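RECORD TYPE: inverse folding
INPUT: structure tokens
STRUCTURE:
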């Protein structure tokens, strides 16, 4: 459908925004890449910024399935098509998007950032399969030497 696509788009976009930022922050602070994060979290303890966290891989997913499930449902429990995209309310404490004249601008920025992130995460992904290294690394690598770190060195 259509309206549904407007949801699909913004939703994936909001995830893609947190993800990308997330992938970079973890590599920049713990040295662990986003692709390995799963394995090292499973093999070594559950942790965040080095510190250890009790939860096992098991009680870990139970909590996820139950907690994201519950919320994904509550969200789906509303067909006011215009809130299925801009729920507002508790989701807008500061009330930045309260004023109707500002709304369109803010929504334009949000959709651009969201489309941008998705694109970038797509990159993040392909860049992992191809280089076996993290995004933050490829980036500081291409910067250290712009000419000899392109994707042409692969074929050449
Ligand atoms: C019951 C608890 C509940 C909680 C904890 C969450 C939590 C979350 N939701 Mg969900 N939701 C919840 C209820 C509902 N959601 C939605 C509709 C949405 C939408 C449409 C979206 C989310 C998204 C998200 C995330 C982003 C929050 C943010 O934007 O930062 C700013 C805000 C804060 C730091 C405060 C945290 C929120 C919390 C206290 C909300 C509790 C809601 C209620 C009081 C009930 C509804 C009445 C409201 C409108 C007054 C976050 C994981 C987004 C997502 O999935 O990202 C990809 C997204 O796009 N939720 C509806 C209405 C249809 C709900 C109804 O009960
Ligand atoms: C939502 C998106 C999501 C995505 C795109 C990935 C992507 C990835 N995970 Mg991952 N995960 C995701 C969510 C989660 N993961 C994990 C736990 C793990 C672990 C423990 C490991 C990965 C690994 C991997 C990688 C290899 C998959 C493969 O085919 O190699 C072949 C397969 C494997 C090596 C075994 C891993 C199976 C894996 C795909 C996990 C299944 C998780 C689920 C999506 C389901 C649970 C939650 C429900 C609520 C959605 C890849 C980078 C592995 C990695 O680090 O290697 C590079 C790894 O060791 N993930 C949890 C649990 C809390 C998740 C929750 O949603
Ligand atoms: C899709 C979103 C997403 C997802 C699924 C994950 C998933 C994961 N992350 Mg990532 N991460 C994200 C977003 C996400 N992250 C973002 C947006 C950031 C930036 C702050 C990070 C930063 C981050 C770090 C630094 C680390 C992880 C780690 C982890 C692992 C779990 C630990 C945990 O949940 O502790 C539960 C959560 C917490 C203890 C609370 C986090 C604090 C919140 C509330 C942040 C508020 C941010 C604020 C201070 C910054 C604003 C700046 C602005 C003014 C400029 C797991 C692989 C750890 C790992 O070892 O991975 C391998 C790890 O060390 N992530
Ligand atoms: C645990 C329970 C749970 C529950 C109750 C729901 C329920 C819902 N979600 Mg949610 N979601 C969850 C967890 C959950 N989600 C988690 C943990 C995430 C990851 C952050 C998401 C991310 C998410 C997104 C991004 C979207 C939804 C959407 C939806 C709705 C439709 C589901 C569907 O039919 O697609 C089932 C379909 C598939 C599994 C097909 C896969 C998609 C393909 C084309 C892409 C292949 C790419 C690849 C990178 C995927 C990852 C694989 C990986 C394991 C390696 C529904 C309200 C959709 C929505 O709101 O629609 C308008 C939507 O767009 N959810
Ligand atoms: C959308 C933003 C984006 C950005 C900022 C980057 C940035 C980078 N990529 Mg890349 N990448 C992207 C998307 C992106 N990628 C996507 C969607 C894919 C899949 C087709 C890939 C696949 C890819 C591979 C397989 C490799 C890189 C690599 C690199 C780095 C070096 C130069 C190179 O050869 O790129 C080649 C670029 C492409 C195939 C990208 C296609 C689309 C771009 C040109 C359009 C976006 C415009 C952009 C220039 C500016 C907007 C960004 C904004 C932040 C300013 C550099 C850090 C290399 C690396 O990691 O080495 C250090 C590498 O080997 N990229
Ligand atoms: C920069 C991209 C961006 C932008 C411009 C917007 C713009 C808009 N959004 Mg979002 N939104 C985004 C990303 C973005 N959003 C992401 C990633 C999520 C997922 C958390 C959402 C989820 C979301 C919901 C659910 C709602 C909105 C709403 C709104 C409106 C009001 C608030 C505002 O103006 O903030 C403008 C942006 C900024 C000032 C930048 C923020 C600086 C932050 C704190 C730094 C990074 C944080 C990080 C490290 C981790 C936090 C994660 C989390 C789980 C809380 C406006 C149309 C509300 C609406 O439509 O109400 C009327 C609403 O209810 N959006
Ligand atoms: C290279 C140049 C370039 C240029 C010029 C711009 C310019 C702009 N970008 Mg883009 N962008 C670029 C490249 C560029 N970008 C690239 C390559 C990317 C990477 C993919 C992006 C990604 C991007 C994102 C992700 C975002 C932008 C946004 C914006 C806008 C800034 C804020 C705004 O809209 O005003 C806001 C308005 C006001 C302060 C005033 C109110 C409105 C008035 C009435 C109209 C304005 C004109 C008026 C005064 C003049 C006519 C009067 C006449 C009757 C006499 C701006 C139009 C942002 C946006 O769209 O947010 C809104 C945003 O979030 N850009
Ligand atoms: C949601 C998304 C990514 C989400 C990622 C998440 C949650 C990641 C989570 C984690 O990583 C962290 C943070 C930390 C790690 O340690 C662990 C995990 C758990 C792995 C990507 C979407 C990515 C979405 C993409 C790339 C979408 C591309 C769409 C295209 C090209 C559309 C094209 C067209 O629509 C036009 C423009 C016009 C038309 O005429 C027709 C067509 C042709 C259809
Ligand atoms: C994707 C995501 C989702 C979080 C969801 C949460 C927190 C849901 C809570 C969801 C919470 C829910 C539903 C709570 C429900 C509580 C209720 C009913 C309890 C109660 C009651 C009442 C009211 C009856 C009243 C009675 O008098 C008392 C009592 C006590 O009995 C988080 C991602 C990240 O954390 C990572 C992974 C890594 C980080 O770096 C960054 C970010 C991005 C932040
Ligand atoms: C709602 C509300 C409410 C109330 O009222 C108020 C408030 C609080 C204000 C609000 C909130 C908000 C928020 C939270 C937000 C967030 C955001 C984000 C995160 C973004 C991102 C965003 C993001 C984005 C764009 C991104 C992008 C990305 C990209 C391009 C990338 C690229 C790349 C790649 C590929 C690769 C290589 O290697 C390198 C690089 C270069 C790295
Ligand atoms: C997909 C796994 C399901 C995760 C758990 C969702 C609990 S969902 C919860 O149930 C109440 C009573 O039945 C009603 C409301 C509903 O949102
Ligand atoms: C199917 C559409 C459910 S719609 C949902 O209903 C709630 C009240 O029960 C309202 O408070 C909320 O604003 C509205 O979007
Ligand atoms: O679409 P933006 O946000 O990249 O802006 C493009 C400029 O308007 C071109 O003049």
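DESIGNED SEQUENCE:
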């Amino acid at each position: 459908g259509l309206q549904r696509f407007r949801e699909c788009e913004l939703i994936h976009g909001r995830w893609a925004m947190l993800a990308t930022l997330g992938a970079l922050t973890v590599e920049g602070l713990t040295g662990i890449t986003w692709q390995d994060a799963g394995k090292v979290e499973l093999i070594e303890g559950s942790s965040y910024l080095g510190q250890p966290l009790p939860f096992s891989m098991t009680t870990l997913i139970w909590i996820e399935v139950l907690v994201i499930g519950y919320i994904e449902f509550q969200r789906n429990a509303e067909l006011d098509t215009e809130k299925r995209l801009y729920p507002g309310g508790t989701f807008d404490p500061l009330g930045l998007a309260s004023d109707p004249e500002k709304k369109p601008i803010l929504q334009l920025a949000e959709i651009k950032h969201a489309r941008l992130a998705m694109v970038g995460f797509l990159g993040f992904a392909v860049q992992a399969a191809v280089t076996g290294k993290g995004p933050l690394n490829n980036w500081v690598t291409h910067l250290s030497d712009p000419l000899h770190t392109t994707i042409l060195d692969r074929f050449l």
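NOTES: The chain has one domain: 1-156.
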